[PDB]
Design a protein around this ligand. Structure first.
Ligand code: NI
Ligand code: NI
Ligand code: NI
Ligand code: NI
Ligand code: NI
Ligand code: NI
Lengths: 100, 551, 101, 551, 551, 100
């Protein structure tokens, strides 16, 4: 595999997201780190699929709603950023006010 | 020109009269003063103020600070104010108005070519915490504590050995020397405690001469009146502190006998409530004496629904764990009867929860008892100053290191913590040690900016090799310093010596000097102050908990 | 498209050109296999291999560098040798020369 | 005897006339020369050539190399050849034919008992990359960069502080000293840059005397003509380089005024295209001047479909990010108008993508514009030499360290990178620093061989304590070296001094010396060279991307 | 008073006559002796014995031990006994009865204020293992080995280079020096081996003078009679050991010729069975000679169902991997014909399985052949002493370091491993190096106790900076020590010199001195001792496997 | 649990495989590190089940086909190796040309 440090670092995000994903499924209102992890993993998989930066910047705002997260969490996350390898290399995705 | 207050806060942080909520608690602070000159605030960025000839002067390195924290909202035992912080030579240079005297008025902190900038607008800045109850069970505790905002650690141990699991003792010259050397590898200020359980003075003097800054008396090694008196005698002659964990079994006598052996000499009583150890069930009464400096360990702070159930595993079980004293402790803290908070790392305490729990107690106390008699105005400023002092200045005073650390005062080592108001006491934005950032949250290393996920705490330059040595302190006893211990062991870090351990008393504890007429009922275990019953209700939910943590 | 693929031009490489060579019939008289290396001084190979040692003096196998020739017990075969160059000084092996020649 | 070419390639690697595809790109190199004597190649293994009395001689350590890279396919600015590489005393000893002179002909690199062997047959060997635009935001950047094949890092900063986020500046003597000490802990060659934004010469001389090898002028600290002229004056007298990030706001003047202040003195212009900073919208015109050494930062290399969308977050937004200049930049690189490539680590750049992106530009340019006028034969050798020089020799020349590193030439420090043709520019097989392997992909530590999964990059001996110190260089300014800074700070690593920073000019940039008559339309932002429009199309898919990375 | 044996075992660990199962194997040990005085055992904890005036005396540091392991069940080549272990100055002080002579009888290990305590009741304590066949492919091997209980590592290499992949050689002065410096960063005792494949004595003397404690002869560098004789000559004059990996190809001659070149001089034969290398197919016959010290590498221990299938990838393949010799090897170990076990780290061996596999062989041999002729009583004590000696004292004797480590004897370095009976040989409870815990299983760092999950091995204080240096040894050759190599390279760790390498012979191998009349059939590969056929059956399931590992 | 370094290292392989496994399920053509991670995890679970080395060396070549991975990936993986604890201890499994 020859995994570089950044690929291994992203495995941490992926795993943090598996935690949140399971909790959401049980019907829990997600907390701060859970929300960030869940929305971030979504975007990375978006790039894997080959979606464009512009598309993800939009789709990212429709992953979790204000009624799926704990009180105050939406305000604790003014935006979310994550990079991933798109077909045309690494690109930065910024989702402003992801939770509404 | 003119600018609305809201826009001003969003740009330079809150000012006089504005209030800020601490994390997700009910505690609200209010800016008491602002040291700036409106319109002359320094801001960094493209086109901003800190630029050559503008907010940056033409002075040489010696005439300007090395680092400036702009628009910081300071929260310290002495005040909750807005100001710029200057740092020079790893120490706090000044708290005032930063800029260039060439074009700006009232500049007290000169910014020059040699000045690095940290933008603290909208952030809360505090001194680094000081935990005086560490069990050196593993070296990984330093990172955990540093990330939480504790920059100094005092305690003892030699690793995961039975002695250390149970007590805060680094037994003898060899182990003391070994730990002093290992300490250079840790990113926090350190001071060791030796085993003070001996009735032969020379055996203690050796340890003090070897390097320890205190002697921990623990019941597991025999906390007898003979042992206690012996440690206190050497302490009086070598200017070091004694930390006590009394005879829970009441084997050699009751609490009154222990107190009698102490004989009015200065001493720091560990976990004074008793759950962590001490004469059952009234060791708590010690907080009424002037020579006693009382602290609490964190697993009992604050009283909640699961506290009791949890403590049983963590005949004398029910005599040691008492709901009555556990509830009283929270109130005694709110009143200033208990002056310190500590962890008791991996031996009935959580290393990374000293700060977090202290604020949880404050919150629960406000909720249950309302405003303190000392409060002025519609804020919780006094309660914030009283509680922050518990893990900053008071621990520093108790162990004779307040001349080096403990608070944001000029001349002190620059151990600072930057917090975003929404994560105060929980997860720090920046942790500065000796003038350099030692640990901070960091995102994707390969990203185009430091913010993309995943963001987690990673070590910085202040935690690297020789830079770390230059930014940390190893506290020695006056004797060890004189014997040239640092040179003999070839210690690489900066050295500080302790002094003033014997002269501190309960009255010197900042905002926590209450000596209450407290009694404990031998049977019912009820705690009473002046006859009135002291107690509180167990919390079912707490702030700074499930909203911030992944596990 | 194959990442890092080669595009070797067709043809052949002539090895050890311009050097004296000689063929020798060799027979393994041992009960165990013997495998000789490309640069091993032939005259000092396992004593169980029977051949004119005198002729193989200062010679090595005329095979591509790194390869080898195996001789199973009782095996008899003709191999080609090529002469050592450089200083033509042999050191090591079974220690029969330890010097020039 | 005789052997077919295919079998030969599979055994000793490709030879003269054979072509090799670089990773999954359209770039094909062709072996121009082979320094071996057919049939006399050295190979290691049981029964192979490198054995006592055979390919290994009887000479003492002083008469043979410490390390030999056998059958390496060298790819350097000077040629793409097949040969053995000898390394002695941490430096490149020779490029020739290895073996034992006792029995082999034409041996120029003697192998003895003291010789370690690295089998490079079938691999491509290159010098270590040199990034001259680092923002020391976190120490983890060195590992990320080292893994990618960059062995030298020049830049500045003090950690995750506002100043460093925005600029490549290590402000003043104290921070400079602290960073020089922290540098010993990093596995790459390092050279620091100070804040050059001051109109008082003495304030700059102090920083140079403190240890910096250059001064970074950044618009965030005020990139005014007064500041620029001041830095250049001190640079001229102390033989250090100046890196510029001009006034994007056009506040003090336009690009022509900046150029006027520079006054024909040598200077390295950071991210000359402008997206990363610089006079809007024509800072790019600087590449036409002889005293200007231009480089690009990597987020804009090469122009793709998501580039623009991404850059907006990473009024002057649209004036800074221009599709027109972004496209032109790729062509200007292909023509040799831009001579360097860098990252701009975590401040609009990716630390581990300098090498990777440089090759992506080359690929896209071949695809769009075909062969260069300088190409000879049916290969892309010239384009490969032109682009590899961008992150190797040219950065080394620009900063006055080309006497120590930058290329595979005798006498230079042995900073080498071994690549498997299928992973060229993406994931290295071996990363050698100063003659020792510092990082490499490593499988199961408990496995019976080093190849079983999971295989990921792990630090090696060359990255450990004192071995690391002996294999890395800390670059000092001639003044710092003379003042005994290394001894005062007690720096443990090897020291190198910079020289020749003022005398380099555009004409000295290897394969990238073009000074085009370039113009930028103030309104449409169109880039024109000699009146002809310069542009390229955005790539939708790139090589060295999704086929190699897990995320 | 009186106490039942069962209650006694649960409180102080088993005593005389009690048996204990080793992990999940069929091996049962029985306590042969107990050095305590019933009723006077020392126990640590609140209210227990080790307290001031009680089990703890009033003596000064010089008159008491630094560390005491209470109620330890020692398992060493000399006996399986119950006793307290005293450690002073990083070395084994005594094996006896610990306590306070003031009130307790028969105290031989005095406990004072300077004494740290490790509770070993119910645990098995052993010396640290010694692996003499390491390929320094990566530095991560030291952690893997340390966690398994191996505290000393001898071998060679320079990292993931072809030479090191194939051989245990640190080629020449430069690499030797580099590795000696890198070694200070590793938490295990280290000794390097150089490339001994040369027919010029001076080239070997240089390496020995540079620092190596031995010379490894490997067939990949040419294991010719000329080379062998040369290494042995220098070895005889410099008192260093030679490790041999013979000519598998039979190129220079057969095994009898190699033996002839050795000429009765002391030599350690690596992987004497042959699968790891050596004259095909009878290198195994070497174990019959008095000057030969034979060892096995671990992938072939013990013979199981997947062994053969696995080995083919890990014409001469079938000649090297022989089921016949693989099966015989296990028996030859059980008989004492093979005296050592090693790993052959990442070059046909598993670094963290030396101890684990040695016990698996013992188990399988008991199962297949029953009790040894030397057994006395209904236990496997003799077989345990015979096998434990294989990776402790014997390796130490073979390489001339038995004066420093190898067994639990007074005056030796305190390299000890504490095991819970259920995890013996698999996962250690504590790993002590030079008197300090270097690595141990550790739970949640933020927990209230060190036991909550997740529990995994983490580095301790004994593995930190200067403390580590003080607790580890770097073994030098007498010449290197005399030339001041440690001072020249500025080595920071403790130094030990090797001696007695030439005088050891098969007869000196503890419990493994058998010199059998062994023959190997050139065709069928059958192994015969005294004409009788030697063989064993392949195991389908083994203990210390799937019940303990997550993967 | 008392996890040794190697057990923790294998957790990295397992997690890398969870990533590939999910992507394959979506119907993506797997890349280099994904393929290696997926086939490797398969073998480890094989040893857990108690299959022999010989069986896995074969079954390993039938996990992914040439039409399930990106172009050039099959040639980038001449073989895959991984060790795991079989009932009879740690053994090495080598799968030659796993993708066909
Ligand atoms: Ni306590
Ligand atoms: Ni405690
Ligand atoms: Ni810039
Ligand atoms: Ni930049
Ligand atoms: Ni070997
Ligand atoms: Ni080996």
């Amino acid at each position: 595999m020859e995994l570089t440090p950044r690929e291994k670092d992203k495995l941490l995000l992926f795993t943090a997201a598996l935690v949140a994903e399971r909790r959401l499924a049980r019907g829990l209102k997600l907390n701060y780190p859970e929300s960030v992890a869940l929305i971030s993993a979504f975007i990375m998989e978006g790039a894997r699929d080959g979606k464009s930066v512009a598309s993800l910047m939009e789709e990212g705002r429709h992953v979790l709603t204000r009624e799926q997260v704990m009180e105050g969490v939406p305000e604790m996350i003014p935006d979310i950023q994550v990079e991933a390898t798109f077909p045309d290399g690494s690109k930065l995705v910024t989702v402003h006010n992801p939770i509404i | 020109s003119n600018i609305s207050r809201q826009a001003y806060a969003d740009m330079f942080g809150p000012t006089v009269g504005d209030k800020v909520r601490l994390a997700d608690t009910e505690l609200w602070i209010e800016v008491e003063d602002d040291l700036t000159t409106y319109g002359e605030e320094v801001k960094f960025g493209g086109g901003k103020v800190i630029r050559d000839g503008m907010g940056q002067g033409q002075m040489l390195a010696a005439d300007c600070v090395d680092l400036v924290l702009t628009n910081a909202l300071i929260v310290d035992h002495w005040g909750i104010v807005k100001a710029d912080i200057g740092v020079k030579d790893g120490r706090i240079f000044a708290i005032g108005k930063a800029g260039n005297p060439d074009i700006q008025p009232n500049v007290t902190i000169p910014i020059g070519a040699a000045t690095e900038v940290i933008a603290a607008e909208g952030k809360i800045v505090t001194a680094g915490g000081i935990d005086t109850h560490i069990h050196w069970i593993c070296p990984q505790q330093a990172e955990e504590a540093l990330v939480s905002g504790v920059t100094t650690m005092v305690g003892g141990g030699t690793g995961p050995a039975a002695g250390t699991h149970a007590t805060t003792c680094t037994p003898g010259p060899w182990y003391i020397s070994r730990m002093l050397q290992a300490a250079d590898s840790l990113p926090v200020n350190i001071g060791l405690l030796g085993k003070g359980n001996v009735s032969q003075p020379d055996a203690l003097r050796e340890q003090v001469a070897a390097g320890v800054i205190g002697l921990a008396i623990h019941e597991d090694w025999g906390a007898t009146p003979a042992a206690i008196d012996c440690a206190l005698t050497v302490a009086d002659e070598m200017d070091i502190q004694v930390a006590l964990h009394s005879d829970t079994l009441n084997e050699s006598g009751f609490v009154e006998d222990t107190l009698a052996a102490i004989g009015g000499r200065t001493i720091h009583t560990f976990h004074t409530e008793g759950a962590g150890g001490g004469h059952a069930p009234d060791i708590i009464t010690a907080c009424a004496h002037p020579n006693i400096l009382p602290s609490s360990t964190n697993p009992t702070l604050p009283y909640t629904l699961n506290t009791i159930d949890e403590h049983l595993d963590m005949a004398f079980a029910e005599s040691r764990i008492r709901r009555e004293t556990i509830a009283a402790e929270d109130v005694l803290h709110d009143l200033g009867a208990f002056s310190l908070t500590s962890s008791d790392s991996q031996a009935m305490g959580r290393v990374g929860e000293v700060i977090l729990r202290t604020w949880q107690v404050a919150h629960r106390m406000k909720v249950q008892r309302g405003a303190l008699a000392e409060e002025t105005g519609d804020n919780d400023n006094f309660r914030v100053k009283r509680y922050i002092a518990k893990y900053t200045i008071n621990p520093a005073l108790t162990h004779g290191i307040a001349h080096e650390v403990g608070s944001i005062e000029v001349g002190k080592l620059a151990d600072l913590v930057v917090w975003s108001p929404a994560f105060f006491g929980v997860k720090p934005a920046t942790v500065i040690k000796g003038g350099m950032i030692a640990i901070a949250p960091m995102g994707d290393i390969n990203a185009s900016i430091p913010t993309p996920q995943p963001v987690h705490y990673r070590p910085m330059f202040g935690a690297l090799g020789s830079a770390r040595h230059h930014c940390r302190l190893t506290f020695l006893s006056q004797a060890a310093a004189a014997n040239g211990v640092a040179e003999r062991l070839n210690l690489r870090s900066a050295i500080a010596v302790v002094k003033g351990c014997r002269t501190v008393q309960k009255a010197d504890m900042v905002h926590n000097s209450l000596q209450p007429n407290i009694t404990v009922d031998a049977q019912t275990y009820e705690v009473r102050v002046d006859g009135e019953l002291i107690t509180s209700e167990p919390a079912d939910v707490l702030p700074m908990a499930q909203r911030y943590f992944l596990f | 498209m194959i990442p890092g693929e080669y595009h070797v031009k067709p043809g052949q490489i002539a090895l050890n050109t311009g050097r004296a060579t000689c063929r020798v019939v060799v027979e393994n008289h041992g009960d165990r296999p013997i495998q000789v290396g490309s640069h091993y001084h032939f005259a000092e190979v396992n004593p169980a291999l029977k051949f004119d040692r005198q002729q193989a003096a200062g010679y090595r196998l005329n095979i591509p560098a790194g390869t080898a020739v195996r001789f199973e017990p009782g095996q008899k075969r003709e191999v080609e040798l090529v002469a050592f160059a450089g200083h033509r000084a042999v050191f090591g092996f079974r220690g029969e020369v330890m010097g020039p020649l």
